[PDB]
Design a protein around this ligand. Structure first.
Ligand SMILES: C[S@@+](CC[C@H](N)C(=O)[O-])C[C@H]1O[C@@H](n2cnc3c(N)ncnc32)[C@H](O)[C@@H]1O
Length: 265
């Protein structure tokens, strides 16, 4: 495929997601998706028992899966652009080769607020809320982490939002050319995103990965420093599966939550 084939396929997927009923959507959303079980975690969150190693969100697992399979090498200083509740930050912290973790996010108008918790490594985590990552002055880092991307029914909106994030990586990577990156690509199937993505690969290496834990309702993929392959091929593969799961009626694949344990480093 040239890239336009990839593009119109994702757009087919989008139209088919939007045309669903609430019934079909809620079913499809989770069908065959890996799902961390939050029964216990939700209780600690509702109660506010910050003395827990359990994940503050479902981002932790996503990051775990990325890292255990080796699409990123979390070492040294780890900047977490757009950290919401801190699920990635708290994961990054629990990891041996990781020194300092700067977590940034808004946490402002119904936006996820960093959750304070005694998960293993919290002392080397430093949150800042009321922060706009796009204007946060570039600092030196070993790892650039960015899980940002507000979904939308309009793919061109989704792609627009994805591009600002790709330019955010470039900026942060021009000062830190040798650092690892895991970067959300909310709309990898659009024509603009694909061309920027391959240009960035040409410059920085890395590639696209689809996370099992991502819901079928989002087409999100991750651009990481240690993966590789054809980008168009990777997105198309992803679109192919997401389209096929529309006949999937079964539930999610439920897996236990991550426990990072309680403690300091
Ligand atoms: C998907 S969440 C992060 C998930 C996180 N790693 C976790 O596991 O909890 C991304 C967060 O970035 C925030 N965000 C979006 N745009 C931002 C911006 N311009 N500046 C700072 N934060 C932003 C959103 O509020 C959102 O909560």
């Amino acid at each position: 495929g040239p890239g336009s084939t990839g593009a119109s396929l994702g757009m087919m997927w989008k139209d088919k997601l939007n045309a669903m009923t609430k019934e079909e959507f809620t079913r499809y959303k989770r069908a065959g998706v890996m799902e961390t079980d939050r029964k216990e975690a939700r209780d600690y969150l509702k109660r506010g028992d910050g003395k827990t190693g359990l994940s503050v969100s479902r981002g932790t697992a996503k990051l775990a899966w990325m890292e255990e399979r080796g699409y990123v090498e979390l070492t040294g200083r780890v900047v977490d652009l757009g950290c919401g509740r801190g699920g990635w930050s708290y994961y990054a912290a629990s990891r041996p080769h990781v020194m300092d973790v700067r977590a940034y996010t808004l946490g402002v108008g119904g936006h996820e607020v960093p959750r304070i918790t005694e998960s293993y490594g919290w002392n080397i985590v430093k949150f800042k809320s009321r922060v706009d990552i796009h204007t946060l002055p570039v600092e030196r880092t070993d790892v650039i982490m960015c899980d940002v991307g507000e979904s939308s029914p309009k793919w061109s909106v989704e792609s627009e939002r994805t591009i600002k994030i790709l330019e955010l990586l470039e900026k942060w990577k021009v000062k830190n050319p040798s650092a690892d990156f895991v970067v959300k690509v909310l709309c990898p199937y659009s024509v603009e995103v694909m061309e920027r993505l391959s240009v960035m690969q040409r410059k920085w290496g890395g590639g696209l990965v689809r996370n099992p834990y991502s819901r079928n309702s989002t087409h999100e993929m991750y651009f990481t420093s240690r993966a590789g392959g054809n980008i168009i091929g990777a997105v198309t593969a992803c679109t192919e599966r997401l389209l096929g799961r529309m006949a999937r009626r079964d539930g999610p694949v439920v897996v236990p939550e991550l426990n990072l344990g309680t403690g300091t480093r």
